[PDB]
Write an enzyme that holds these catalytic residues in place. Structure first.
Site, PDB file in Angstrom:
ATOM      1  N   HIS A  79      -5.792   2.923  11.327  1.00  0.00           N
ATOM      2  CA  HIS A  79      -4.340   2.728  11.267  1.00  0.00           C
ATOM      3  C   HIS A  79      -3.631   3.465  12.387  1.00  0.00           C
ATOM      4  CE1 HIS A  79      -5.679   1.704   7.151  1.00  0.00           C
ATOM      5  NE2 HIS A  79      -4.902   0.673   7.424  1.00  0.00           N
ATOM      6  N   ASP A 120       3.310   0.870  10.161  1.00  0.00           N
ATOM      7  CA  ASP A 120       2.417   1.979   9.822  1.00  0.00           C
ATOM      8  C   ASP A 120       2.718   3.248  10.625  1.00  0.00           C
ATOM      9  OD1 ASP A 120       0.647   1.438   7.647  1.00  0.00           O
ATOM     10  OD2 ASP A 120      -0.511   0.037   8.870  1.00  0.00           O
ATOM     11  N   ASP A 230      -1.014  -8.121   8.276  1.00  0.00           N
ATOM     12  CA  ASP A 230      -1.534  -6.756   8.139  1.00  0.00           C
ATOM     13  C   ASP A 230      -3.047  -6.764   7.855  1.00  0.00           C
ATOM     14  OD1 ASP A 230      -1.376  -3.852   7.852  1.00  0.00           O
ATOM     15  OD2 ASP A 230      -1.143  -4.080   5.697  1.00  0.00           O
TER      16      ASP A 230
HETATM   17  C1  LIG Z   1     -11.833  -5.584   9.066  1.00  0.00           C
HETATM   18  O1  LIG Z   1     -10.656  -6.013   8.357  1.00  0.00           O
HETATM   19  C2  LIG Z   1     -10.488  -5.258   7.199  1.00  0.00           C
HETATM   20  C3  LIG Z   1      -9.243  -5.268   6.555  1.00  0.00           C
HETATM   21  C4  LIG Z   1      -9.055  -4.524   5.377  1.00  0.00           C
HETATM   22  C5  LIG Z   1     -10.101  -3.765   4.842  1.00  0.00           C
HETATM   23  C6  LIG Z   1      -9.984  -3.035   3.657  1.00  0.00           C
HETATM   24  O2  LIG Z   1     -11.152  -2.806   2.948  1.00  0.00           O
HETATM   25  C7  LIG Z   1     -11.141  -2.244   1.694  1.00  0.00           C
HETATM   26  C8  LIG Z   1     -12.341  -2.065   1.023  1.00  0.00           C
HETATM   27  C9  LIG Z   1     -13.638  -2.505   1.673  1.00  0.00           C
HETATM   28  C10 LIG Z   1     -14.642  -1.377   1.917  1.00  0.00           C
HETATM   29  C11 LIG Z   1     -14.591  -0.630   3.083  1.00  0.00           C
HETATM   30  C12 LIG Z   1     -15.603   0.490   3.312  1.00  0.00           C
HETATM   31  C13 LIG Z   1     -13.528  -0.926   4.146  1.00  0.00           C
HETATM   32  C14 LIG Z   1     -12.355  -1.479  -0.233  1.00  0.00           C
HETATM   33  O3  LIG Z   1     -13.546  -1.336  -0.903  1.00  0.00           O
HETATM   34  C15 LIG Z   1     -11.156  -1.089  -0.832  1.00  0.00           C
HETATM   35  C16 LIG Z   1      -9.942  -1.279  -0.163  1.00  0.00           C
HETATM   36  O4  LIG Z   1      -8.766  -0.904  -0.761  1.00  0.00           O
HETATM   37  C17 LIG Z   1      -9.932  -1.855   1.109  1.00  0.00           C
HETATM   38  C18 LIG Z   1      -8.729  -2.042   1.804  1.00  0.00           C
HETATM   39  O5  LIG Z   1      -7.669  -1.689   1.300  1.00  0.00           O
HETATM   40  C19 LIG Z   1      -8.733  -2.640   3.087  1.00  0.00           C
HETATM   41  O6  LIG Z   1      -7.510  -2.868   3.724  1.00  0.00           O
HETATM   42  C20 LIG Z   1      -7.243  -1.968   4.806  1.00  0.00           C
HETATM   43  O7  LIG Z   1      -6.905  -0.660   4.305  1.00  0.00           O
HETATM   44  C21 LIG Z   1      -5.754  -0.654   3.424  1.00  0.00           C
HETATM   45  C22 LIG Z   1      -5.497   0.789   2.945  1.00  0.00           C
HETATM   46  C23 LIG Z   1      -4.515  -1.164   4.168  1.00  0.00           C
HETATM   47  O8  LIG Z   1      -3.408  -1.221   3.278  1.00  0.00           O
HETATM   48  C24 LIG Z   1      -4.788  -2.554   4.738  1.00  0.00           C
HETATM   49  O9  LIG Z   1      -3.670  -2.991   5.496  1.00  0.00           O
HETATM   50  C25 LIG Z   1      -6.055  -2.546   5.608  1.00  0.00           C
HETATM   51  O10 LIG Z   1      -5.833  -1.789   6.792  1.00  0.00           O
HETATM   52  C26 LIG Z   1     -11.328  -3.763   5.513  1.00  0.00           C
HETATM   53  C27 LIG Z   1     -11.528  -4.495   6.679  1.00  0.00           C
HETATM   54 MG   LIG Z   2      -1.577   0.939   5.877  1.00  0.00          MG
HETATM   55 ZN   LIG Z   3      -0.931  -1.894   8.293  1.00  0.00          ZN
END
Ligand SMILES: COc1ccc(-c2oc3c(CCC(C)C)c(O)cc(O)c3c(=O)c2O[C@@H]2O[C@@H](C)[C@H](O)[C@@H](O)[C@H]2O)cc1
Ligand SMILES: [Mg+2]
Ligand SMILES: [Zn+2]
Length: 326
Positions: A79, A120, A230
Site C-alpha cells: 500500500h 490510501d 482498488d
Molecule cells: C494481487 O492482488 C491482490 C489483491 C488483494 C489481496 C488481498 O488478499 C487477502 C487475502 C489473501 C492472502 C494473502 C496472503 C494476500 C486474505 O487471506 C485476506 C484478505 O483480507 C486479503 C485482502 O484483503 C486483500 O486485499 C488487499 O488488502 C486489503 C487490506 C486492501 O483493503 C485491499 O485493497 C487489497 O490491497 C491480495 C492480492
Molecule cells: Mg487499503
Molecule cells: Zn487501496
C-alpha cells in the site's frame, strides 16, 4: 532535492495514452520510473478532459501529483504510491475501455480520479480492515478497527496546500459537491463499507433494476467502482498478479511481526510468516468471498469491463491449482 522532481516533470513531454499503455486492463507499472508514473497520471487527467474543463494550471497539477506520491511510504511493501497509481490507472481503463466515462458527469470523474490517487494516503503498513480465516469456507471473519481512518483528511490537506490546489478552478458549490464525492469514494475503499453495501448493488443488478440516474444508486455504483479498481491487482495476468500478491503477503507478515512486538500476541494466520504454505488457499478464499461477485456485477453495467472478471477467474484457477499443490 525535492524540486528537482517538479523541475523535470513540468518540462517533460507527456506521451500519448496509447504509448503509455494506460488504456489496458493488464497494465503493469513495474517497468516505469517514478517520473513516468507521474507522466501517466498527467495523461489520465488530460485525456479525461479534466485539465481543460477545470482550468488546471500545468505546474499546479504537477506539484499536486508529486505531493500525493511523496506522501505515500515506499517502505510499505504494497500500500504505497504504486498501488494508488495502479488504482487510478484501472479507473482510467474502466472509464475509457469500459466506456464508463459517458455514464458519469465530469465532476464525478474528477472526484473518482483524485480519490483513486489519494485513497490510501494515511497508510503506514497497518491494515485495519481485512478477512481472517479466508481459507476456511464456513469460518471466514471480516475484521475492522473500532477507530476510523484519516485518508480523506490527508487528501484534503494536499488539495488545500499552497501550489497544489488543482480544484481552485471550480465554483464554490462545485467545490463543495466534489469534496463530498471524493470523501465518499475514499471511504468506500474500506472493505467494511464494501461488504456492508454490496448486497444492495448485487440485488439491483440481479433484478435489472440498476438505475444510473437515481442519485442513491449512482453513489452506490461509484463506491463499487472504487473497490473494483482498488482490488484490480487480483485480476492481472498471472505473473504480474503473483508479483503483486507477494508484496501484499510481505506487508501482512510485516504487520504480524509488528503487532507481535507491540501487542505481545501471535498474529492471525494471514499475518504469520510461518503460514506461507497456506497462501494459495487464502488467495482462493479471498477471491471467492470478495472479488468474483463484484467483477461479475460490474460487467452488467459495463460489458467491456469483462477483462477484469476474466482475469480474476484465471487467477483463481491458478491459485486453486497451487492450493491442491501442483
Ligand atoms: C494481487 O492482488 C491482490 C489483491 C488483494 C489481496 C488481498 O488478499 C487477502 C487475502 C489473501 C492472502 C494473502 C496472503 C494476500 C486474505 O487471506 C485476506 C484478505 O483480507 C486479503 C485482502 O484483503 C486483500 O486485499 C488487499 O488488502 C486489503 C487490506 C486492501 O483493503 C485491499 O485493497 C487489497 O490491497 C491480495 C492480492
Ligand atoms: Mg487499503
Ligand atoms: Zn487501496
Amino acid at each position: 532535492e525535492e524540486t528537482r522532481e517538479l523541475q523535470s516533470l513540468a518540462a517533460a513531454v507527456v506521451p500519448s495514452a496509447q504509448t503509455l499503455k494506460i488504456t489496458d486492463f493488464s497494465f503493469s507499472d513495474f517497468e516505469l520510473s517514478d517520473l513516468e508514473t507521474a507522466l501517466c497520471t498527467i495523461r489520465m487527467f488530460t485525456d479525461l478532459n479534466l485539465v481543460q474543463n477545470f482550468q488546471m494550471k500545468h505546474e499546479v497539477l504537477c506539484r499536486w501529483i508529486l505531493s500525493v506520491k511523496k506522501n505515500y511510504r515506499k517502505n510499505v511493501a504494497y500500500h504505497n504510491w504504486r498501488h494508488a497509481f495502479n488504482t487510478a490507472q484501472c479507473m482510467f481503463a474502466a472509464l475509457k475501455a469500459g466506456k464508463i466515462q459517458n455514464k458519469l458527469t465530469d465532476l464525478e470523474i474528477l472526484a473518482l480520479l483524485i480519490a483513486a490517487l489519494s485513497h490510501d494516503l494515511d497508510h503506514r503498513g497497518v491494515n485495519n480492515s481485512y478477512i481472517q480465516r479466508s481459507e476456511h469456507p464456513l469460518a471466514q471473519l471480516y475484521c475492522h478497527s473500532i477507530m476510523e481512518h484519516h485518508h480523506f483528511d490527508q487528501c484534503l490537506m494536499i488539495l488545500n496546500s499552497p501550489g497544489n490546489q488543482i480544484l481552485s478552478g471550480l465554483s464554490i458549490e462545485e467545490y463543495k459537491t466534489t469534496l463530498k464525492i471524493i470523501k465518499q469514494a475514499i471511504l468506500a475503499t474500506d472493505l467494511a463499507l464494501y461488504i456492508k453495501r454490496r448486497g444492495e448493488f448485487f440485488e439491483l443488478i440481479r433484478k435489472n433494476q440498476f438505475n444510473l440516474e437515481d442519485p442513491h444508486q449512482k453513489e452506490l455504483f461509484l463506491a463499487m467502482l472504487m473497490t473494483a479498481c482498488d482490488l484490480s491487482a487480483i485480476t492481472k495476468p498471472w505473473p504480474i498478479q503473483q508479483r503483486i500478491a507477494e508484496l501484499v503477503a510481505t506487508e501482512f507478515f510485516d504487520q504480524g511481526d509488528r503487532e507481535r512486538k507491540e501487542l505481545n500476541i501471535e498474529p492471525t494466520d494471514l499475518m504469520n510468516r510461518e503460514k506461507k504454505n497456506k497462501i494459495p488457499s487464502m488467495q482462493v478464499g479471498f477471491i471467492d468471498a470478495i472479488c468474483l461477485q463484484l467483477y461479475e456485477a460490474l460487467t452488467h453495467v459495463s460489458e467491456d469491463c469483462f477483462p477484469l472478471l476474466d482475469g480474476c477467474r484465471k487467477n483463481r484457477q491458478k491459485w486453486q491449482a497451487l492450493a491442491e499443490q501442483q
